[PDB]
Design an enzyme around this catalytic site. Structure first.
Site, PDB file in Angstrom:
ATOM      1  N   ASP A 119       0.758  -1.244   0.000  1.00  0.00           N
ATOM      2  CA  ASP A 119       0.000   0.000   0.000  1.00  0.00           C
ATOM      3  C   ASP A 119       0.804   1.320   0.000  1.00  0.00           C
ATOM      4  O   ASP A 119       1.357   1.695   1.033  1.00  0.00           O
ATOM      5  CB  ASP A 119      -0.908  -0.077   1.236  1.00  0.00           C
ATOM      6  CG  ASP A 119      -1.842   1.056   1.467  1.00  0.00           C
ATOM      7  OD1 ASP A 119      -2.208   1.721   0.495  1.00  0.00           O
ATOM      8  OD2 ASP A 119      -2.245   1.251   2.616  1.00  0.00           O
TER       9      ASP A 119
ATOM     10  N   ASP B  94      -2.568   5.679  -5.013  1.00  0.00           N
ATOM     11  CA  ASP B  94      -2.800   4.733  -3.914  1.00  0.00           C
ATOM     12  C   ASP B  94      -3.044   3.293  -4.349  1.00  0.00           C
ATOM     13  O   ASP B  94      -4.156   2.942  -4.731  1.00  0.00           O
ATOM     14  CB  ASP B  94      -3.963   5.264  -3.047  1.00  0.00           C
ATOM     15  CG  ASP B  94      -4.180   4.556  -1.733  1.00  0.00           C
ATOM     16  OD1 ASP B  94      -3.388   3.621  -1.415  1.00  0.00           O
ATOM     17  OD2 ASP B  94      -5.129   4.933  -1.008  1.00  0.00           O
TER      18      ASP B  94
HETATM   19  C1  LIG Z   1      -5.762  -1.093   2.368  1.00  0.00           C
HETATM   20  C2  LIG Z   1      -6.504  -0.190   3.348  1.00  0.00           C
HETATM   21  C3  LIG Z   1      -7.077  -1.065   4.469  1.00  0.00           C
HETATM   22  C4  LIG Z   1      -5.646   0.993   3.853  1.00  0.00           C
HETATM   23  C5  LIG Z   1      -4.575   0.566   4.852  1.00  0.00           C
HETATM   24  C6  LIG Z   1      -6.482   2.092   4.488  1.00  0.00           C
HETATM   25  C7  LIG Z   1      -7.236   2.958   3.512  1.00  0.00           C
HETATM   26  O1  LIG Z   1      -8.300   3.445   3.845  1.00  0.00           O
HETATM   27  N1  LIG Z   1      -6.686   3.106   2.252  1.00  0.00           N
HETATM   28  C8  LIG Z   1      -7.400   3.934   1.297  1.00  0.00           C
HETATM   29  C9  LIG Z   1      -8.702   3.375   0.802  1.00  0.00           C
HETATM   30  C10 LIG Z   1      -9.727   4.262   0.520  1.00  0.00           C
HETATM   31  C11 LIG Z   1     -10.929   3.772   0.050  1.00  0.00           C
HETATM   32  F1  LIG Z   1     -11.949   4.588  -0.253  1.00  0.00           F
HETATM   33  C12 LIG Z   1     -11.119   2.418  -0.140  1.00  0.00           C
HETATM   34  C13 LIG Z   1     -10.110   1.532   0.166  1.00  0.00           C
HETATM   35  C14 LIG Z   1     -10.379   0.096  -0.082  1.00  0.00           C
HETATM   36  O2  LIG Z   1     -11.528  -0.291  -0.283  1.00  0.00           O
HETATM   37  N2  LIG Z   1      -9.276  -0.730  -0.126  1.00  0.00           N
HETATM   38  C15 LIG Z   1      -9.460  -2.164  -0.314  1.00  0.00           C
HETATM   39  C16 LIG Z   1      -8.114  -2.788  -0.626  1.00  0.00           C
HETATM   40  C17 LIG Z   1     -10.048  -2.824   0.903  1.00  0.00           C
HETATM   41  C18 LIG Z   1     -10.867  -3.933   0.750  1.00  0.00           C
HETATM   42  C19 LIG Z   1     -11.408  -4.539   1.865  1.00  0.00           C
HETATM   43  C20 LIG Z   1     -11.153  -4.062   3.142  1.00  0.00           C
HETATM   44  C21 LIG Z   1     -10.354  -2.947   3.303  1.00  0.00           C
HETATM   45  C22 LIG Z   1      -9.809  -2.336   2.184  1.00  0.00           C
HETATM   46  C23 LIG Z   1      -8.900   2.009   0.634  1.00  0.00           C
HETATM   47  C24 LIG Z   1      -5.420   2.601   1.968  1.00  0.00           C
HETATM   48  N3  LIG Z   1      -4.727   3.075   0.988  1.00  0.00           N
HETATM   49  N4  LIG Z   1      -4.906   1.622   2.785  1.00  0.00           N
END
Ligand SMILES: CC(C)[C@]1(C)CC(=O)N(Cc2cc(F)cc(C(=O)N[C@@H](C)c3ccccc3)c2)C(N)=N1
Ligand SMILES: *[C@@H]1O[C@H](CO)[C@@H](O)[C@H](O)[C@H]1NC(C)=O
Length: 339
Positions: free
Chosen positions: A37, A225
């Site tokens: 990430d 990202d």
């Molecule tokens: C990977 C994720 C836990 C973290 C550590 C936190 C986060 O909020 N984002 C941004 C972000 C913003 C957003 F709007 C959506 C998602 C997202 O949906 N990421 C996917 C990969 C996901 C799927 C299932 C559970 C958590 C995250 C991620 C990011 N870059 N990393």
């Protein structure tokens, strides 16, 4: 210090929304599925100390320090507040293996892991590829520790995210540490300098929707990202974008009538010298062509608070089209047409 090593990690693509690879932690290694990430700077995995009243901990791999002979106790409280929610636990140190590189790393043992969103996650944890400036608890990030070994050819890392296949023969994606893989891009890289060191964020000159719609007219920010599934913009920008597309809002996403999906206009992101165009096939999850079904768009709203935001975020939807190189030596991001 620069060496001659390049290390690659094969990624699994889950539904075009989650791209994860493996790491081994401890002696003997305990393996975890992790998102690499650029949107965060800490390493964390679920802990054996996570109460099984958090259901996400029942359905994920948990790190057990009591089974590792190379573990070194720390215990400092750690709270990671993300756009998707909070996780919390404590700091621990152990040996981490990533693509053959072995590194002694300080990471978070997560004891509080909310069912929303982590019960939807196919991966267990996160490998923050962001800078030390954004690391919670001032923990040295994994890429900084790998760089300190002076084994990598270049102070860069690259991402290739494939389109989702049902064929097991399909490579879900690939992260290269120390370089880029010419088998997964064509043409040349075009670089955009970072606004500042510390964040994988660049200046954006405008967003075009077809011919007659324009957003980010006076310039805006773009966070690149790898940990985000979709492209995101502010609530205000996305309302205008979606109105231009004829898309209607639901609880968390935006939809179009499936039959209308293939007609939607191109979306262009003006970054550095070039226009980065996504056609409707690149941003519509075309699950059917029915006039009676709704098809989701791989674009949504996310209001990122200051100092990082307000910003757009170019997630997996963008990276699938454009192979991405994150250059630490020059504080820049390179894009090339993926293949
Ligand atoms: C990977 C994720 C836990 C973290 C550590 C936190 C986060 O909020 N984002 C941004 C972000 C913003 C957003 F709007 C959506 C998602 C997202 O949906 N990421 C996917 C990969 C996901 C799927 C299932 C559970 C958590 C995250 C991620 C990011 N870059 N990393
Ligand atoms: C945890 O690690 C950091 C590393 O800088 C150190 O400053 C801190 O004192 C450690 N805490 C314990 C209790 O080992």
């Amino acid at each position: 210090t620069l060496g001659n090593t390049t290390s690659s990690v094969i990624l699994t693509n889950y539904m075009d929304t989650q791209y994860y690879g493996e790491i081994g932690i401890g002696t003997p290694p305990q393996t975890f599925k992790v998102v690499f990430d650029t949107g965060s700077s800490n390493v964390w995995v679920p802990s054996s100390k996570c109460s099984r009243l958090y259901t996400a901990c029942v359905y994920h791999k948990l790190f057990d320090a009591s089974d590792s002979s190379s573990y070194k106790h720390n215990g400092t409280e750690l709270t990671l507040r993300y756009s998707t929610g909070t996780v919390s636990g404590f700091l621990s140190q152990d040996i981490i293996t990533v693509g053959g590189i072995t590194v002694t790393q300080m990471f978070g043992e997560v004891t509080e892991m909310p069912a929303l969103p982590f019960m939807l996650a196919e991966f267990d944890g996160v490998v923050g590829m962001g800078f030390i400036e954004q690391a919670i608890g001032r923990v040295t990030p994994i890429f900084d520790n790998i760089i300190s070994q002076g084994v990598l050819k270049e102070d860069v890392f690259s991402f290739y995210y494939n389109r989702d296949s049902e064929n097991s023969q399909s490579l879900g994606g690939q992260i290269v540490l120390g370089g880029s893989d010419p088998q997964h891009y064509e043409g040349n890289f075009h670089y955009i300098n970072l606004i500042k060191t510390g964040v994988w964020q660049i200046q954006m000159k405008g967003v075009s929707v077809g011919s007659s719609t324009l957003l980010c007219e006076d310039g805006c920010l773009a966070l690149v990202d790898t940990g985000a599934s979709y492209i995101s913009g502010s609530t205000s920008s996305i309302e205008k974008l979606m109105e231009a597309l004829g898309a209607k809002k639901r609880l968390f996403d935006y939809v179009v009538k499936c039959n209308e999906g293939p007609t939607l206009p191109d979306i262009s992101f003006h970054l550095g010298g070039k226009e980065y165009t996504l056609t409707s096939a690149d941003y519509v999850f075309q699950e059917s062509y029915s006039s009676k079904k709704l098809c989701t768009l791989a674009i949504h709203a996310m209001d990122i608070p200051p100092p990082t935001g307000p910003t757009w975020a170019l997630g997996a939807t963008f990276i699938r089209k454009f192979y991405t190189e994150f250059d630490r030596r020059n504080n820049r991001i390179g894009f090339a047409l993926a293949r």
